[PDB]
Amino acid sequence: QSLEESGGGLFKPTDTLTLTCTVSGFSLSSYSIRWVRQAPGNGLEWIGAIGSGGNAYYTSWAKSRSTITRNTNENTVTLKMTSLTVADTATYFCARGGINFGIWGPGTLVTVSSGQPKAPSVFPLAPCCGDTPTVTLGCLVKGYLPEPVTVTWNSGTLTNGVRTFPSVRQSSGLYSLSSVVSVTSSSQPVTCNVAHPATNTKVDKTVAPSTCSKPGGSHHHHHH
Amino acid sequence: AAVLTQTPSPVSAAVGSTVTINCQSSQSVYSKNWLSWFQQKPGQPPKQLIYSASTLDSGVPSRFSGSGSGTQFTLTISGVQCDDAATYYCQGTYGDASAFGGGTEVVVKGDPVAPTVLIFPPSADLVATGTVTIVCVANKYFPDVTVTWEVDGTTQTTGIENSKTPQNSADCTYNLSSTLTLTSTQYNSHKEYTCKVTQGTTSVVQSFNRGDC
């Protein structure tokens, strides 16, 4: 019994949002499906729902610009919302109704912005050369729109003590964040794996243990 | 048009104390007990703790208890722990709609810890972009700190952005990223870069000199 939202990403003001909730392991004919959104840093809000018989319900602000429908043969519920404004920027969830309201989808981020999409550039974070050499290393992820990015370390095998900070929106409208991880000075290379779903961009960076050049390997960065 | 009103945010609670969050519905919830409680930590989706007003969801700690009926509901957290730092929402269902309360943020006061500080110069490849970002991290601290940046000893005002992790589920601590952004020309015009983190009367500092990296 699970749900998955799709259709999120970047939209311009005036565009139409079309989210699909795809359900698995239960029947739409036995349950309501509710749509809930959450603006960044704000509260949960019920948008509307569709009942087990296919009739929809809406909150006052949604009613006149939202439609909620379903396809029982394709296991989907659709939210269509017209006339997007930046204030519609939010994570949108579908969830299975009933007295036990515990099964939600993972959520999909909707960004309404006049800005153009931009994939992240990634830069390694390592201590400045010159001290005695465990170490904390990181990746800076910057210049992207819309949210989110994902960041893993060594493809998700390295999770202990990972700190991935909340994103911050710059005046440019672009986002950035850093991720840091602490590792033992004598362990194998660490790689941050960054993804930006909106642009289908993947960026992986292997982070050196410091800014010092090692004697071996390539030497593509000289002081100037 | 049923509306739910909860305990004003934020609720500050010492570890081991008992937290109470109250929730009032302007109309009776359906059948008196269609009322759930949700927990949410920043950067994660909400998790149902309680449904049917008083039934604990699977795997939810015994510390949580829901009570009430009709229009008046309570969530209590017995012996609150760092893992319980979160925003809590009541959620009601009615004849023709559902709704959420405004949320009550619970901030858990644990044992004080001084930060350690790390500073990270820009890589050669970042300098090559024309815009430098220098990253400072303040690790595992409580209570909150303030951060300043010094460039050749001089405190900066502009080009600083800060981001803080939510309270750690084991020890209640925060982590902080602080970044200083400058042009590569500006970066190359100074030598010493310092991140200074202040927690009350105590300061921790980490520095690098550009020419050493």
Added chain:
Amino acid sequence: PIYDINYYTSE
């Protein structure tokens, strides 16, 4: 059967 009985009356 259904689980969203909140939306329905018997008659």
